[PDB]
Structure 1
């Protein structure tokens, strides 16, 4: 099964998922000098006030905080998007060391981690239908650097002990994802894909320019999670990131000068 090890990692994924070598794969390096300001891009609208978190799951690849997406409660609109996209889950990718972990890079710089807030286009009715469409998902990507703690992350950090191993879940209600956002919503955007199998080319990527700061202790706790199930040999959940993929025939657009 695919993963992040030497014998099942990103360089192997194309054998089961040939779209891994496709025309709009993610992540990519964001070359800040080549991204063009697009004055027709609108401000992002992030409307998370009525978000209903439900559960946190270790799925063997990351941990996902899942939301009730059966109504328009937490939605992303505006920016490059047409229509309304509903928040379904968020998760992170992170490194074994503070010098790596993000999937997107900025002028080849790797951040310590990257947050993905995953939303699906309500015109397709459900997430499974949306991933079959070129405009089915919008993923809001936020970089994490190590410095001061992020207060709004701590409730996530403190439940990770209860979902150490693959397949474990825990109740995770009343979590407010607004506490994970930076001050500015300036962003880069481009068309891409899921960054794990099935690698479907269904994502409008919206990557915020401003990172959030998390503490060394917060990210150290991410690194105590396990890829393995309970009662299996312990393999720390670290370096669960895909490296940058060829940009090919795409342009990255900036919302800001």
Structure 2
């Protein structure tokens, strides 16, 4: 795939024109992220998303578009009665999803694959408040330059990054970076978690730019709540 970014000639509005591989950015009708209007969402009998994570975080990488924690892939969540294995988690500032037209300052994405390669992403909003103890373990060894990897000696428990309340919005969408492939299950937790002002500012300093894709039209979709 061709080089892409968050501004200039290779920014989100141009992604669909950068490569034939990125065509869904241009033609897709089921794209992510979205604004979640809570009144427009349909109240629904959604199943609990059960979490069976393990502490198998291997390293943290700065890949030039996010900070990503890479996992061994043994932990999983249960969605639609199937195991989706946690491969990695990573971060955006400001939030990619909005709620009633408003951003949160930060959003984490936990990226899972089932045995057939189907993708489920769990989304967690963060607000500025108390220092997040689990996040601090990652932040302490944040790779400051693109291309850098840092081994984790501290034991990261990814379950501790999720909100205590597990209510969520669900919809069918896409990856938020090229090639923006569709057929992705989105589980967006309603309750935000806290990070310190200092934690937010370090991420923003290291990144050096905002890394959220603009919200995309719902089209025929409904969000369930």
- Per the shorter chain, which TM-score range? over 0.9
Helix, strand or coil at the partner of 1:143: strand
**Deviations 1:153-208 (CA, angstroms, capped at 9, x unpaired):** 11111111xx1111110112521112211110000000000000111113100000
The alpha-carbon deviation at position 51 of structure 1 amounts to 3.1
Partner residue in 1 for 2:221: 250
Q: How many aligned positions are there?
A: 218
In the alignment, does 2:158 pair up with 1:177? yes
Distance in 1 (CA, whole Å) between partners of 2:213 and 2:36 is 15
Distance in 2 (CA, whole Å) between partners of 1:151 and 1:179 is 9
Distance in 2 (CA, whole Å) between partners of 1:201 and 1:82 is 21
For structure 1, which runs of at least 5 residues remain unmatched after alignment?
95-100, 125-129, 131-135, 227-235
Q: 4+ residue runs of structure 1 moved beyond 4 angstroms?
A: none
Q: Which moved more, 1:50-59 or 1:189-198?
A: 50-59
Pick the aligned partner of 1:64 from 62, 68, 71: 68
The alpha-carbon deviation at position 6 of structure 1 amounts to 2.3
Partner residue in 2 for 1:10: 12
Partner residue in 2 for 1:120: 113
**Deviations 1:10-56 (CA, angstroms, capped at 9, x unpaired):** 111010212013011000000100111112x21110111x2311011
Q: Under a length normalisation based on structure 1, what TM-score does the superposition of the two structures give?
A: 0.82
Alpha-carbon contact 1:164-1:224 (below 8 Å) kept: no
Distance in 1 (CA, whole Å) between partners of 2:85 and 2:113 is 5
Distance in 1 (CA, whole Å) between partners of 2:120 and 2:55 is 17
Distance in 1 (CA, whole Å) between partners of 2:196 and 2:95 is 16
For structure 2, which runs of at least 5 residues remain unmatched after alignment?
none
In the alignment, does 2:152 pair up with 1:150? no
Q: Under a length normalisation based on structure 2, what TM-score does the superposition of the two structures give?
A: 0.93
Alpha-carbon contact 1:193-1:201 (below 8 Å) kept: yes
Query: RMSD in angstroms over aligned alpha carbons?
Result: 1.1
